[PDB]
Amino acid sequence: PQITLWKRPLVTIKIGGQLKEALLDTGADDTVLEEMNLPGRWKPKMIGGIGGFIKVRQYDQILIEICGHKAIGTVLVGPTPVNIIGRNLLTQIGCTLNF
Amino acid sequence: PQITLWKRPLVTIKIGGQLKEALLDTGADDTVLEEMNLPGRWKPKMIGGIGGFIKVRQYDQILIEICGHKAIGTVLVGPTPVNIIGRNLLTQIGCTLNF
């Protein structure tokens, strides 16, 4: 689709059997989701932004559907206040910025 | 232009006579720039993100060129580590996400 920016670009995602909403975030290197259990093996990670840095759990080769577009890759889970879809997954679904 | 997301979407901006680079950030409600002097009247503001909240100075009706596209509006200045072009200005230059 083509998404405009008058509101926050929150779209529907599906991950580990659950439906969520997530922000398509061209300013996020990585994908970061609110707390949730996800399969198996993780390795710690730190991410920073405005205000500071948080500890997250990194999970590799995770399947995630983003508005009907399936992608497999790295998902981080931790104390973010919004689910964020970062460039790691945006590249996979073919996402571009246009103006 | 059409920008892909393999790298961070850092583009050239011009503000208050200076050339800078800034991230086109669909995850930022607001525009936020590293420390710099700018004309006249400001009113305090707080912004949050990952890790916490920072204090910024809000400036209204500021002219800013974003890759050749001129926009006037609110610019915040404060201790951000990257210059961020948020949705307030992205809407003005006609910026959309497409996939």
Ligand SMILES: Cc1ccc(N)c(N)c1
């Ligand atoms: C369900 C699942 C969990 C972790 C990994 N690493 C993979 N590939 C798949």
Ligand SMILES: Cc1ccc(N)c(N)c1
């Ligand atoms: C140069 C300049 C500074 C502040 C404001 N508010 C405006 N409009 C213009």
